[PDB]
Amino acid sequence: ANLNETGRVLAVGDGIARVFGLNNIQAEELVEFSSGVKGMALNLEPGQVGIVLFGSDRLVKEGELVKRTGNIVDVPVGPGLLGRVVDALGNPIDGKGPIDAAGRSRAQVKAPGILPRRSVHEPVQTGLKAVDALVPIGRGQRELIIGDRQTGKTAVALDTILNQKRWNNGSDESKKLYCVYVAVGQKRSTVAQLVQTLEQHDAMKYSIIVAATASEAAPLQYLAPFTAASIGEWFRDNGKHALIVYDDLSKQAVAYRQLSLLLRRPPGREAYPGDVFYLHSRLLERAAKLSEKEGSGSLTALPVIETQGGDVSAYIPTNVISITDGQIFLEAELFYKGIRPAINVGLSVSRVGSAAQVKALKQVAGSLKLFLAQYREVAASAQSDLDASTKQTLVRGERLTQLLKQNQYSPLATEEQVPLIYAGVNGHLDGIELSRIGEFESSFLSYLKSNHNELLTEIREKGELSKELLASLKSATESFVAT
Amino acid sequence: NLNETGRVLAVGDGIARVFGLNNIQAEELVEFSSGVKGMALNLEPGQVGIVLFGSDRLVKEGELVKRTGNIVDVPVGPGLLGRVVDALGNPIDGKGPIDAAGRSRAQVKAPGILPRRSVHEPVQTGLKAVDALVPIGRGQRELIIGDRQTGKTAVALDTILNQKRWNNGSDESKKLYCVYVAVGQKRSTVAQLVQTLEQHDAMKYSIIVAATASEAAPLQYLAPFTAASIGEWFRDNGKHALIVYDDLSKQAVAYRQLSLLLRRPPGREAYPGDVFYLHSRLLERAAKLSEKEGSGSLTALPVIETQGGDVSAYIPTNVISITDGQIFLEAELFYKGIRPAINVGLSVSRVGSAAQVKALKQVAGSLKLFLAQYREVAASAQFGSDLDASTKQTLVRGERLTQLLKQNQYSPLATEEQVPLIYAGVNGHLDGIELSRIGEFESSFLSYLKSNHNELLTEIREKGELSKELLASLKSATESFVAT
Amino acid sequence: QGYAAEISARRNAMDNASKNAGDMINRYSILYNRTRQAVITNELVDIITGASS
Amino acid sequence: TPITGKVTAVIGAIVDVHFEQSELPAILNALEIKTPQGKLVLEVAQHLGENTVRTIAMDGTEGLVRGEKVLDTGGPISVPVGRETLGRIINVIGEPIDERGPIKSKLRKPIHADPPSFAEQSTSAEILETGIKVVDLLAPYARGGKIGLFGGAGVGKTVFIQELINNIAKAHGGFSVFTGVGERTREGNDLYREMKETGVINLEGESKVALVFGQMNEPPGARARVALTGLTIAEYFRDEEGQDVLLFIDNIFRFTQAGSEVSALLGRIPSAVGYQPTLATDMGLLQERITTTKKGSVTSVQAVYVPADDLTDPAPATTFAHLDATTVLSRGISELGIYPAVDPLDSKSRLLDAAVVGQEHYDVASKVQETLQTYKSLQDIIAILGMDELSEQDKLTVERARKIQRFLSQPFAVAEVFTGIPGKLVRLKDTVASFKAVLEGKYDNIPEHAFYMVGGIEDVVAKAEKLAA
Ligand SMILES: Nc1ncnc2c1ncn2[C@@H]1O[C@H](COP(=O)(O)OP(=O)(O)NP(=O)(O)O)[C@@H](O)[C@H]1O
Ligand SMILES: Nc1ncnc2c1ncn2[C@@H]1O[C@H](COP(=O)(O)OP(=O)(O)NP(=O)(O)O)[C@@H](O)[C@H]1O
Ligand SMILES: Nc1ncnc2c1ncn2[C@@H]1O[C@H](COP(=O)(O)OP(=O)(O)NP(=O)(O)O)[C@@H](O)[C@H]1O
Ligand SMILES: [Mg+2]
Ligand SMILES: [Mg+2]
Ligand SMILES: [Mg+2]
Structure with missing residues (x-):
């Protein structure tokens, strides 16, 4: 021997x-x-x-x-993993046989340096009214989805993946966005069921699943996000674009804690090792948008964190917030009221995405950022005077709040989005009741498709609002509302 | 070998x-x-x-x-005045060799039970709030405690500066030689402090001992003990020294670093098991020596930093149990415009009035209890009350008494200046005066008494006491000024 | 009339207060719980460091 | 003919190296392992006995093997010092990372240096006008001082620094050094594009700022040391070039964090909260070198991360005493849309003193502070029982404090995207007077909203009339 x-x-x-x-x-x-x-x-x-x-x-x-x-710990990579479900070491778990690898990448790969990067300017279209309008995500960004148990975190990421079906059926390779979904610590059945959803919406052919589920060994859970980033990175390094959801990092951190304490490393705050920040930071630094010289690829990260009792100040939440380029915070309070997506706008932000927003949305999002999360000033105070001035903002506020609601599995095209917001921001909803804003929206889009499709097409193809299209849009809006 | x-x-x-x-x-x-x-x-x-x-x-x-x-020792002696040295007594002001009367070990047995006498001579700090409400005696340990940036050093600093009234004389029995111990501060902060002592001509009777933030933990740990020895010489030879430990929180941290790296098993919050002892033996050494021992004293003002107002924290709880009372400084009082930001309710001087020039004791009757009765009421005023004649008045009196306790930094006062102020206050010769003008009253009035009724102030400085004659003169004198 | 206006205004202001109080009670029961957990952990780490040596 | 040993042990960032000779490399010496791609650098930390040393690697240790040859450089980590560093981007080990060729500097200095003695200290009380209202008013910055920005995650530390670089950097005369410690590589990209675009770094021309980076992707060794690198350069300007130097660091907490990541692997028993026993002295050895001396002047801004928003955590708390000025950013505040999210009752200055700023300035700052304080002591009662249950005095103070609260907010130029409004800037003398007047009850009839996100008092008047039309 x-x-x-x-x-x-x-x-x-x-x-x-x-x-x-x-x-x-x-x-x-x-x-x-x-x-x-x-x-x-x-x-x-x-x-x-x-x-x-x-x-x-x-x-x-x-x-x-x-x-x-x-x-050194590595994994298969390449377009051959598309449609496949694998474990943290790259081994197929979907019953479908050996993976077809372009080659192997290490689990731990160093982040793109200071030079090979360019600011994000290309939209990642979520198809979610609230996210696209108010927390726009750009290709290469990192945006945290954070909130309590059962608040729609996964839904937000999954609608984003389902939404890509829009471009991943076209030919133009630059508009396409391949998807890596990482399940860490979840139930096997959740993930199986998730994959079937993806299959049913025909999203699976452009997405990769990496699963390290609840009964698996802590190191497999620790590792999964890292092997998923190299899988994600292949697209990045080969002039293409990949979206990576880390669902969720809270559970990755917990597994890492298990390993460290058994390794007898000193427990710090909340019993996590000193390197639990480096755990996430090195992982997430690998998301990027690359320069012309580096082929212009991008990896976009959507890490998911789970707060307890809604406290974003705990150790792990604040660690990740100090890494990512913004947060989409989901409130359990809104969620229980029926406001879903339950995006707390006050506490949500995108630090780099504004650049990458589609102009049309940017134009009808005039101050919506400021106004809405400020109608929240009046709203909180409201329930001492039956005011005149501040009775208006309470009626607009309430409207935009309903406009922002959205059913699950129903991501919407930009050109389907901008009218609804235009129609809200300019107060054409002010007269319509709350209980009918739901029905208004479905009926309004039908009207637009059949009768004013020329205009939607113009929004879609130029992405801007010329004074003329702006004025023409005012026309069609007033008509429908009146009846 | x-x-x-x-x-x-x-x-x-x-x-x-x-x-x-x-x-x-x-x-x-x-x-x-x-x-x-x-x-x-x-x-x-x-x-x-x-x-x-x-x-x-x-x-x-x-x-x-x-x-x-x-065994670790240090140079001690009068030669050290005006100087700044490190923990081992090596000079760090570039002023060359120290000349020392001798060398004492760092760790010295404290005075036992027999060789002591009750504190009875005041350490005049010059600050109205302290001197009236928490008077400090020669040989007392009075803790200064509070959160970061709450005035802690400014309390100690105004005491050192105030000693000028006596240190410029030859009378050796009245003089108070000062020792300041910077531990884990940044060098710049210390330079700024010896710059200020210089400008006030206080450096000539002070000794600085600095184990600043970049220095090895053994240097920071040691600094207080070697600084006790420097100070002990004054005590052991019929003189008097004040000793400021700024601060002990940082020394406790250094001792912890020392002990963990020696692989000595830690205790609570990773501090060594004997961290209480660390501080108790240091401060037991401050003491008022008996006549058979020459009558010298060492007064200690140790400084502790609390975090988030937390006085129940381990180290602050340790030191509180060692000293003869505390001065609690509070950020919330600092911002209401109370300076020094002393919480009167929580601050005691245990030696108490036995260490207070008699005149001040008289005029500050139940000032401390009264001020408590004031806040007992400033509590009932909250839910929108309406008070009877006694309560609305004492509410007015205290609101002004509080106002009279405000004081600028580097503006310490003599007892004979302090006494008339407290006198006017407590008696009610300030009630019928608009609140915002008590500041300009204080200086106008002390000038008035310096020109008109100066013989009075002269009397208090010399005779440290009051008789009916001094009372009625001053009562007649103050009543005079009120009508501007 | 002034009395019945006052009495109606009390029951109304107190409803808003008890509501507003409960809200803080909710927010502090949560902080309580965090701190309580933290206390048990932090105490345990000292026992642990102490045991290792 | 060098000094060589073999690798005996590898645990994370820590590598143990045995040497065959009597002679052993000094603590703080740089060692080298030749690899497939480049060279791995290690810094001697301790001598374990039996001719073995413990080192901290400066890059990942994946792929190392027991028995692997180790080279001694016979010196510590060294950096390019001088003007040749200006407009370059540099490593923890002093190599360039902007692909622009060697830094052809005449000298290279060790990153570990002893701090300037007590004798070498040079104190002043000289105000540094920032054009930011709260800072200029309530807690003034000091030329050659040590300024620190404390904030939780996302509360505004980096935007603040960029505003300060935007204010002080172009018109300073002297040279800036920016050091990124444990932050976003992209943020470095955002800034290297920035100093290029503003001209403070000119590719062909001449440049005023050197950049040094050790971001959060980097192994712990690199995070620890990269601040000592960026400092060693700052010190060469201060000393031999008698330069008045500006040093920015984002973020200084990351230095101490990196220290705790490895402390365990070095054999130390953990102090409180899992931090290294040496947290304080490590910080003293770094902090104390960042000072203004008799030979020259260093004004230094430091981003300071606050873990879990806990300002009592050993790290930020131990940081306080090192600073002449502290701006504490609050989440609670920023969540009211108040930017900068400066806590006006927890930010402090040595220079807030009448003998520096004049009694009028002092008196205003303090009455503002008393006013705000009254509101604080009341918040609980305002939130439970409303405004109705205050005495008139209080009701008026509360009414006024909220106008001050909002007036302390200011549109920064670098947060134009989040404000929607052009960046305003207010001259100290105008801040003093503007606030002075609000206190004097001169603007009570004005609605709260007119003080929110404007410059000076002229701007309130304007926005009040804008609303009234
Ligand atoms: N936009 C939506 N509209 C209506 N219902 C929704 C929406 N999004 C999610 N839901 C439902 O709400 C529940 C919670 O959503 P989910 O996306 O599972 O959140 P989560 O935060 O990932 N929960 P978990 O990960 O299990 O703690 C699920 O049953 C969803 O079906
Ligand atoms: N009586 C006073 N009136 C007004 N300002 C004062 C007064 N005393 C002190 N200050 C100022 O308040 C600040 C804090 O005082 P300081 O004496 O340093 O307290 P500290 O708690 O030791 N601070 P630190 O060592 O930084 O934790 C200093 O800038 C003082 O100049
Ligand atoms: N001056 C400002 N005006 C308006 N919004 C701001 C301002 N500063 C910060 N913000 C908001 O908060 C975010 C925080 O950005 P940043 O300045 O990086 O804070 P930070 O505390 O360094 N974050 P991190 O280092 O990740 O913990 C910004 O992108 C804005 O959305
Ligand atoms: Mg989920
Ligand atoms: Mg101090
Ligand atoms: Mg930052």
Whole structure:
């Protein structure tokens, strides 16, 4: 037995195997145990190596042989993973056979530096009225989806993926956006069901699923987002665009905490290791928009965080907020009232997306940012005087609040969006009741499609509002409202 | 021959584990061949753990460590006045050698039970609020405590500056030599403080001991104890010294760093188990010596920093239990325009009135209890009350009494200036005056009494007491001024 | 009339207050709970550091 | 003929190296491992005994092998110092990262240097006019001072610095050094595009600011040290060039955080909250070098992250005493749409003193502060029971405080996207007078909204009439 290429197990417990030999091993090299279970050389010491396991401890005994692999932790990458569901190490879990890899990338890849980047200016269209109008996301950005349990976090990301069906059926490769969805810590059934939804809406052919679910070993959960970013990165490095959802990072952090405490690293705040920030920061730095010279690709990140009791000041929330380029905060209070998406506009922001917004939306979003989250000034005070001036903003406010509502699985085209907002901002809804704003919107879009389709087409094709189209839009709006 | 020398076994983080040094004493000074000096704090079977008094960048495995044969000591003596030194008494003002009467160890047994006498001589701080409500005696430990940037140093600083009234004389019994201990402050902050003492000509009777923020934890830990010794000389020779520890919170942090790196198992909040002892032995050394011992004293104003108003925190709770009372400074009072931002309710001087020039004691009757009765009422006024004649008046009186306790920094006052103010206040010669004008009253009035009724002020300074004759003169004199 | 106006205004202002109070009680029951958890963890870490040496 | 050892142990950022000879590299020396791509740099941290040293790597340690050859450089990490650094982008190890060739500097200085002695200190009380209302009014910045911006995540630290660079950088005469520690690589891109576009860095021409980066993608070793690199350059300007130097750091907390990431791996017992026992002295050794001395002047702005919005966390709390001026940003405040989100009752200045700013300035600042304070002491009662249950005095103070509150807000030029409004700037003398008048009850009839996001008092008058039409 070569002790250079090979090892003998000294001990195993707490997700670590202590191994003797493997003298030629590299730090962070993947290893193989007798049972076929894999590991990662984490700490090389005089006279032994400490290996973190990617499975149950049952699958490793004392005295067993361990084989070197040659390879730092890596994964298959390339357009051949499209339509596929894999585990954190890249192994298919969808019943469909060997993955078709263009090649292999490390799990841990260094972020694009200061030079190879350019500011985001290309829209990521979500098809969500509230997000596209008020927290516009640009290709290369990082935008946190954050909020309590059961507040629509996943819905927001999933509508975004379903929405890409719009361009991923065209030919123009630059407008396309491939999707990597990472499930970390979720239930197997949630993810199975999610994939079936994707299949049913025909979204699956442009998306990749990477799953490390609830009963799997902490390191597989720790690892999944990293192997998913290299999968995402392939598109970035080859002049194409990929969206990556990390659902969710809260659970990644928890798994990382499990590993650190069993590794006997000192518990800090909320028991997380000191490096739990570096955990996320290195991951998320890999999202970017690249320069002309680097082929202009982009990886856009939508990490998901789960607050407890709505507290965005906890350690992990604030860590991620101090990394991403903004947050979409979802309030449980709005969610229970029926306001869904429950986007708390006061607390939501996109730091770089404004540039990348579609002009049409930008133009009918005049101050909507300021006004709405400020109607919130009056609204909170309202329930001391039956005022004159501030009775108007209470009626407009209430309207735009309904306009922003949106059914699930129903992402809407920009040119379907801008009229609804124009019709809100200019007060053509002021007269219509609350209970009918829902029906108004479906009936109004029908009207526009059948009768004023020339104009929608112009919004879609130029993305701007010429004074003439602006005036023509005023025309068609007034007509419908009157009846 | 490993009895006087040793070899560095391992080194880092300002800590060295040394082989040999077989005859070394616990707490002994050592010299590493590369120049740096150290202190043996761990003596174990096969080795010695030493904390470095400087950088360890130059220490190497195998390097030779030498016994000094000395327990950490310092130069002490009158020669040190006007100077700024580090923890080991090395001069850091570039003014050359110190001349010392001798050397005392850093750690010194405190006065026992027999060799002491009750505090009875005031430390006149010059601040109305303190001197009236929390008077400090010669040999008392009075804690200064509060959150960051609340006035803590400005309380101690106005005391040092005030000692000028007596330090410029020859009368040695009345003089109060000052010692200021900067621990973990930034050098610039200290330069700014010795710049101010200079401008007030207070540096000539002060000694600065600075273990500032970039210096090795063993230097910060040591600074208070070696600074007690510098101060003890005054105490041990019929003189008097005030000692300001600015601040002990930062020294406790340094001791913690020391102990964890020595791999001594920590206690609460990672502090060493004996962190209470760390502070108690320091402050027990402040003391008022008995006549058979020359009658000298050491008064200590230790400074603690609380976080978020948290006085129940470990270290602040420790020190509170050691001292003879505290001055609680509060950010909320600071911003209402109360300076010094002293919480009167929470602040005591335990030695109390036994350490207060008699005149001030008389005119400040139940000022402290009254001010409590005032806030008892400023509480009932909240829910939109309407008060009877007594309550609305005392509410007016206290609101003005509070106003009279405001005071500018670097504007300390003499008891004979303090007394008339407190006198006018408590009696009610200020009630029928518009509130916003008590400030200009204070200076107009003290000028008035300096030109017209000056013989009075002269009397109080000399005789430190009042009789019916002094009372009625002043009562007649104040009543005069009220009509502008 | 002034009395019945006052009595109606009391029951009305107090309704808004008790509502507004409960809201703060809700916001502080949450902070309470955070702090309580933090207290148990932080205490445990000292026991842990102490045990390791 | 060099000094070589072999790698004995690898745990994360920490690499242990054995040497075969009696002679062993000094603590703080830079070592080298030749790899497939480039060179990995390690910094000696401690001597473990038995001829083995412990080091902290400056880049990832993936791929290292026990037995791998280690080279001693016989010196610490060194950086290009001098004018040749201006308009370049540099590493923690002093290599360029803007692909513009070698920094052809005449000298290279070690990044570890001893702080300037007590004797070398040079104190002043000289106001630095910012054109930002709250700062200029309530807590003035000091020329050659140490200014620090404290904020939770997203509350506005970086926008603030960019406004200050926008105000002070072009008209300073001297040279700036910006150091990015543990921040967004993209933010570096946003700024290198910025200093180019404004001309403060000119590709062909001449440049006033050197940039040094060690962002949040970087392993801990690099995050720890990158501030000492950006400082060593700042010190060369201060000393030999007798330059009045501006130093910006975003973000200084990241330095200390990087220290805790490795502390465990170095064998230390954790202090409070899991931080390194040396948190304070590590910070003293860094802070104290960032000072104005007798040879020259350094005005320094530091972004200071506040973990979990907890200003009592050892890191930010230990930072306070190092600063001559502190601006504390509040989430609660920023959530009222008040930008800058400066807490006017928790930001402080050495220079807030009548003997510096004049009694009129002092008196206004303080009455403003008393006013705001009254509102604070009342908030609970205002929120539970409303305005009705205040005495008239109070009702008026509350009415006024809220006008001051909003008047302290100001449209920055660099937040034009989020304000929708052009960036206004207010001369100190105008801030003083404008506020003075509000207190004097001169603007009570004006609705609250007219003070929100404007410049000076002329601008209120304007917006009040704009609303009344
Ligand atoms: N826009 C919407 N309109 C109506 N219902 C919705 C909308 N979005 C989500 N829902 C429903 O609300 C529930 C919560 O949404 P989901 O996207 O699962 O949030 P989540 O924050 O990911 N919950 P979890 O991850 O399980 O804690 C789901 O049952 C959705 O079907
Ligand atoms: N009586 C006073 N009136 C007005 N201002 C004062 C007064 N006393 C102190 N100040 C100022 O308030 C600030 C804080 O005072 P300082 O004495 O440094 O308190 P501290 O709590 O030791 N601060 P720090 O060491 O920074 O935590 C300083 O700028 C003083 O100049
Ligand atoms: N002066 C301002 N005016 C208007 N909005 C602002 C201002 N400053 C910050 N914001 C808002 O808050 C965001 C915070 O940006 P930034 O200045 O990077 O804060 P920060 O505290 O450094 N964030 P981080 O470092 O990630 O914790 C901005 O993108 C704006 O949306
Ligand atoms: Mg979900
Ligand atoms: Mg102080
Ligand atoms: Mg920032």
